[model samples]
Target: IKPATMEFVSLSNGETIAYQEVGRRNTDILVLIHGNMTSSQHWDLVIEKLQDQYHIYALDLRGFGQSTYNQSIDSLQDFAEDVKLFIDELKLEKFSLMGWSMGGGVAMQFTANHPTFVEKLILVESVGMKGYPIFKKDTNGQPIVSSLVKTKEEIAQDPVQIAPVLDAIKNMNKLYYRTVWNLLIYTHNQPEPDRYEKYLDDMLTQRNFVDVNYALITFNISDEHNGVVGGSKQIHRIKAPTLVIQGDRDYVVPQVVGEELAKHLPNAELKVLEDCGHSPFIDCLDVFIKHVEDWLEQ
Candidate 1:
């Protein structure tokens, strides 16, 4: 079997978005949008299996994968616009979209604005429900500070002060990575990749790390201003069929977020996989593809 390969397109926005297309043509197109900190490589398993049956495309959103990251993205709306532009630029119409984690927010926002363009919507461990808060509280129930930066200068100084911020960020990253890894090992009966250490290192080295941290901070502020957090109200307005997939063991996006979204999307179906984590594609590839295939057939 031919391994999946990466493709690129320069958007009118002057940003080059990197993507991968696989499988056969003349079949339904399924676009995968990955979450923060991960590139299109995150969907490797899904694309490999599904490409033979359905045309699959996975994109590295700006600042994440190989996509250009010169401009700062502040809101989910901006991210959604990028998706719309990507599809239009590629001349894709009536394709299904699946987004994981933060990509879920972008997918939801896009589907709301361009209902006619999307055939179906799939959200995996997504956030952006009305009653949902992204920040977890401390023991006192006060919002916890998840900031990677302690001061503004830490951001401005870039690589100089990024060391401390990256160290702080790694603490949370390890928690999420370990949880997901454990769930995958238990659920899939697969051996852990030996490159796990390298993977973590690559994640830290991909961008300025500080730039990603800054983008995340700005994104939250923009989300608040654009009412992205209260976006569940528009869920019922989504005309496309929807699937909300969640892993019960997922701690990053959490199962509650998926439940809230399912309740609001009028034409949505919810599937909570046991023993799975953030990346269902990796944790349980066979089951994940089956769920998607079964849904598309219906």
Candidate 2:
């Protein structure tokens, strides 16, 4: 399938959000929120497949893709606020919103803040209700679960996880990112050559890795505390029906995270795809799409 035209819109937040418009305008709207280190480009395949079924709008959150990052985001709520601006600007009234990885966190924040806007919510390999934590590492390079990294400076200084990625992103090291994705994200299935190259190029465009990481590290909407901060206790505010799709072999967000989402969401269903990793769209597109398609139909 050919790629959709890249579009730009000015948000009230003083940011120019970049997005892709696909499929038919008359169909049910599906707004896709991409994860960290990625852009709307990451949804190319899903958009291609679901275009016939729904009108899709995939956005590049702030610093990712071609979006302008005039300012930094401190919380997932900030990203959600950007979405609110985007949809409001387009005069989109009701739509099903889907988020992958970090995007799932953003979707939850958005839904909680604007409960009436989203009709349905889909989370793919999402972070938990308690939010994804990055504990301090010990001298042996092991994660210290008892101690969470609280500051953006601390997260930027993460030796094992964040530091190398920040370096690679700064240097535009395509091979480093490709290797990391191969190891953690695409364990079950890899994207095709040309597409993979395009994704790498898109990944390099991210400029807020440290800030986004810090945002995720501190994101907690549950009633319980996440290592870094107290929960906002806002998950109950999300009124939309949610579908939580998880992969058995996802390396980034664990099965427990998806379970947390399923358990905490006011109305949610969980589906576990066997042998699938982080990117089910790349790992097992058919299974992923079928679950989403079926849920949307219901």
Candidate 3:
């Protein structure tokens, strides 16, 4: 999705970081990172609700949004480095960070690698475990990656080269789109129809859309034996106080993922939102913000 027309900051590491800033600057400083394929635009909903209390900076990692650069970006380490360069360039001495999905992995990795940068950390339905659950390792013990797991052929092909097939599936397949959309948004859980439409529009393919393709190819391969994508081999290295928001009904990073994540991070509190899905902020907005605000305050 096009992540609005945001300002771009070029880092010495040869990549640009795209970001949109929101909220007040009283005491709360937040750097939010979005998930794979999805840009910082995903945080628009969160920013809308939380801006009054927290100063929010929604950052689009390297491949997404206005952020650019990806030449053989093989591991999440490459992605993490992009963020590291971004933060360093910005000269943010200390700030709270929040990340969702793959962004969770990057956030954790950043916290661990930098150690002294983050004052607080937040992870939402993240991916940062050696042996994953459900999607990667289901409760029923499936060998496949996801229910809609792309065929091995798809995974093996070059991301830039494989665009045609992916485009075909997205365009010619209405049933595919409907099924995936329902699974992503959880239609029944959305109370506000307008919010759902906004969420839909935020994630629609536009501008730097293929950023997701590169992420799907590179990130999944990174070995997070100790949780962080390409970070310190120990999850305990993350010293910042942390809050983890887990959607009870999330399919991708199942309940077990959150359960184990809290146990893994040295200083972390896990908050579960019942009847919510992968995108907990969208699924349960007030509850999500409440957890974050409470964590931030404490």
Candidate 4:
């Protein structure tokens, strides 16, 4: 596996994208899109394991990692458009795509619009097509399930979910991020201290939490409305065979999300990773690697 060094490419969209390239060019190309609060750095473990089999490119979405956020994005479609620019800039054709969490939403949007570009789609603990909802917390600090935080302003004021995170990001509170990750994403396992520290540093680079969360809340592509917005009915446009992998113990995105994705996508397969949480690469590296390899080979 070749060590990936950060590379920069300025796009026609006026934003310069940051990406990492690894592995041999002779093999099939695989593009990795990371979730919210993460950049291509999160895919390091997977790239290390899979590079020998396939050439890999992992990019940081706008406002995350080293990617510049010159203009704000209000929808996942903006991200998809950015990915389109990135792909066109690279002159890549017929490559496989993998997205995690929010990146999954971005990937779906990209695939739906550019069906002929992606050969295969892989989603790991991806958010559902209906989009993820943030609910208001009652006076008792319990989530009022039916009460959706409707607007960006309300979401910004959300005490239970958004406020603390916003504060943490604003303050660069690494400890808060570490604690949250431990309680939610790294329930089963965590990266070593050094790597985890680097990840914490990476998480601090995000500048658009409210915009991203609001986009996720309104990112509906299915046939039905998602409380906040009407469905775009674009999910059907994704023609690539899809693989949806969700950890059974994932706290951030539940198994239901994967199930929904598998059922909705025209040709999709779902795999439940056992004894794992949101970070399957850290929780169950070998099996996660195997699942990805198996799907790619198929």
Candidate 5:
């Protein structure tokens, strides 16, 4: 049970980015990016398996884990830039990149922009494809059924005005949350009850939940000037050898999204996992590891 080594780098924005590294540096580097409300801990099992053979790095993206929250930035590109800065600060020239969910979107943007820096690319349930306008539309086009009640003063000031809106937002995504919870429970192999409960609690905490809500309510992938943004157009620009691992039952970022991405990229492979949802690493660890290892070997 070797714990990951934690380190921090100061960013230009007066904030520090926290990251964890494992395994030997001479080995091929594999940088893992976690999704919304999740930290590097999500990659614990996978990293443990691969650390012996590969150098692994996992970072806590801004506002999610130990990383500082950059209140100024509001887009996925901003997140990607943060990753870029991390790589630059570390002086890591070429490495494999993998991202899950929202982090997947960030990974795509980063890899597309810095093609020379990325040796290989992996996306798990990635977002930001034009063909799948449903994600963007559902996130931004839908009316905000919730109000911003950040401070206690705001809540006490107008509970009546805020309660229904909050309820509506929660109700609107009932199916989505239910699916996410079910997937989390189904994937882990009888994970410790206390750790599982803590993971759930950390995700659902008021601050984290609000940040996720803010991302959902305000995310816009259509902006080009933002930062390695855009969908199919950008996907076509990715030059790195890519592997898209998606689950057949992923409602968040469906199999269709991965298929479309793979179809566009000149050098890409798509692997659809059976009986899996969003988190394939946990849902089918052995198969996922085998696939990734084989791909790396090639």
Candidate 6:
């Protein structure tokens, strides 16, 4: 695997995007889009095994990480357009797309509208499928979700559950390197990785939580709105070969969504990882690499 080197690209709208490059230029290209709230740094551990066969580049989408958070997103489709612009700026003629969580939806939208340049598509615990529990706009005409929890109608059909899951959302959303859903992501009882805390500390010190929160909240709202997902029925239009990896233990996107996502894509397959959580690449590193490496090599 190739080591990561950082660089910046200036967009037509005057927004500067930060990306990391790994692997050799001569190899087939692979572009990674991390989930909401995180940056390109999310791919650091996963790319180590992938750099040999594929020239890898991970993007920090607008409003997250080093990318500019200058605009309020009206819809998630806007993200697809932004990525297309970013790809053009970099002159990437054709490449496979890999997107995690919310990014999975971003990649899917890009492939659906402009299948010409996308060679293959990979969805890691994606969010665009019909089964996703996140609902549409509320009676007030705003997105269903504000932070990351479901509304009253979705949750047992009440007063928006209890108090906000702000502490969990705040922690799981970012900062301490994640895992807040269970507790550290909680209750899972897995020991922290080496330097997990240190890396979290460094990231917390360097990044902007207030602005990052704004970006995440905006994207989550737009993303949660069912209308913005392009309707699951249209997914068959995506002709690119697809691979979806969803951890059975993942509660956020859940394995059911992965099952639905695979069926939605015309040419797609699902690999349900055992005993893995939201970030399977982190939870089951070896298995995740094996699945990704073998599939891309195909």
- Candidate number achieving the greatest lDDT relative to the actual structure: 4
Model 4 TM-score relative to the real fold = 0.96
Give the alpha carbon lDDT tens digit for every residue of 135-234 in model 3: 2334554444443333334443433233543563357533433456586556556536555444444444333434444444334323352232342355
Task: State residue 267's C-alpha deviation in candidate 1, in Å.
Answer: 1.2
Question: Model 5: per-residue lDDT, tens digit, 206-283?
Answer: 223334433432343332322222323566667889888888877667788788768876798999988777777657
Query: Against the true structure, candidate 6 has what lDDT?
Result: 0.66
Off by over 4 Å in 6: 1-5, 131-195, 198-233
lDDT of each: 0.68, 0.89, 0.67, 0.90, 0.67, 0.66
Give residue 85's error in model 5 in angstroms. Answer: 0.8
TM-score of 5: 0.75
Q: What is the TM-score of each candidate against the true structure?
A: 0.76, 0.96, 0.78, 0.96, 0.75, 0.75
lDDT of 1 by residue, 100-186 (tens): 877887788788889888898888888645422323344564454563333334455543235544664555465444444465433
Mind giving the per-residue lDDT tens digits that candidate 4 earns over 36-128?
Answer: 999898898898898887888899899998999999999999999999999899998889999999999999999999998998999999989
Worst 10 residues of 2 by lDDT: 1-10
Q: Spell out the clash pairs found in candidate 5.
A: none
Error of 5 at 229 (Å): 11
Count the clashes in each prediction: 1, 0, 3, 0, 0, 8
Which whole-number lDDT from 0 to 100 does residue 49 have in model 4?
94
Better of 1 and 2 by lDDT: 2
